[PDB]
Amino acid sequence: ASKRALVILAKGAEEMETVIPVDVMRRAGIKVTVAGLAGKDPVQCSRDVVICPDASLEDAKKEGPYDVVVLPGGNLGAQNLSESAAVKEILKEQENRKGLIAAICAGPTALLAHEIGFGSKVTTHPLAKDKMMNGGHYTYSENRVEKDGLILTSRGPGTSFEFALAIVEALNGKEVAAQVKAPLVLK
Amino acid sequence: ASKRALVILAKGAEEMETVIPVDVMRRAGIKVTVAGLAGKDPVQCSRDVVICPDASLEDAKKEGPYDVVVLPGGNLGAQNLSESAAVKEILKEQENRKGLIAAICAGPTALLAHEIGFGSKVTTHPLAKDKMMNGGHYTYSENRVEKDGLILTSRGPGTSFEFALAIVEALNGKEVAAQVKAPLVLK
Numbered sequence A, B: 001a002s003k004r005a006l007v008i009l010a011k012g013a014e015e016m017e018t019v020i021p022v023d024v025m026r027r028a029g030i031k032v033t034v035a036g037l038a039g040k041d042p043v044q045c046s047r048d049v050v051i052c053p054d055a056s057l058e059d060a061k062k063e064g065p066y067d068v069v070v071l072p073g074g075n076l077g078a079q080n081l082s083e084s085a086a087v088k089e090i091l092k093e094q095e096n097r098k099g100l101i102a103a104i105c106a107g108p109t110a111l112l113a114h115e116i117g118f119g120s121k122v123t124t125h126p127l128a129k130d131k132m133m134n135g136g137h138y139t140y141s142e143n144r145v146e147k148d149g150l151i152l153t154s155r156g157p158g159t160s161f162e163f164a165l166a167i168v169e170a171l172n173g174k175e176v177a178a179q180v181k182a183p184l185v186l187k
Ligand SMILES: *[C@@]1(=O)C(=O)N([C]C(=O)O[C][C][C][C])C2=[C][C]=[C][C]=C21
Pocket: A014, A017, A073, A074, A075, A078, A104, A105, A106, A107, A109, A125, A126, A127, A128, A131, A156, A157, B183, B184
């Protein structure tokens, strides 16, 4: 059976960190739902790219649960995810069921806000380290991608392919990830 | 004065190759117009990401000319660009005025279709080489980014950051490109 991914898309999301994982996961045969935090309407990303979500979060939640929940970064995107009770509920449920949660750039700061994965080794964008580490609830890593059990984090737009391929590997295995990687012309 | 970029967005465009250059160019202070080939409506990209263009191509053309014209790849995107009389006119004008033209993945095959930049050293996605080289009108390169004068080409999603930063360097210089690069967390 096909794996399923929920990508939560908020105003101010970093559009590269949203699109690269969506695209790469689809290349891997994952069924991906791009879910609008605010509803079903188009979302203005951080650099003004406008993306039309597949569904509202409210609706995508009804079709849960998912094999992965993905949190893009972007400062204002991650803040919107951090402030959302709906995101809180989704992440708590995911953690409780031992499902994967993946977050990139400032995205992992939503894990802090929602008290998810405490004690994990994590990375973030360098600029988001201090926010993530407030209280010493995680251990910090400078690895480009950090997978600690079911908490998978990464650093920035430039690590988005690596992040996405790590998700693919976690869900579908090493061999699928390698097959998906080759046509991309990655260094 | 600020440089201006026209990114031509067709149905079936590779969304990573569209979004990474748009975002990176905006980070560089370039004024970017995402122009819908078919009109003003949202565009279904290759992996089903839906992007709302800033304008129709018809309208963006009236605000021309541009310091760069950018052609994303995607097989079906590049075919739509290749078949477009409007794209032909835009590229011929750009070439005649000695403005930069940048194309990635299958995107450079539109240069062939429109008889642009013949004699240039170019690259493409490996799978698009034979189409690009039909007639021996270009010389082929395996470099991740190839800049030959005002024809700038690149290979795939995994070379999109390098492609975008090369555009930035061409328009705004080495130092701006380096400054834009550092926060991205690129290898
Ligand atoms: C990331 O895409 C991203 O999310 N940020 C935001 C950030 O780190 O802000 C720190 C503020 C505390 C949350 C960012 C910054 C720079 C380049 C890329 C990215």
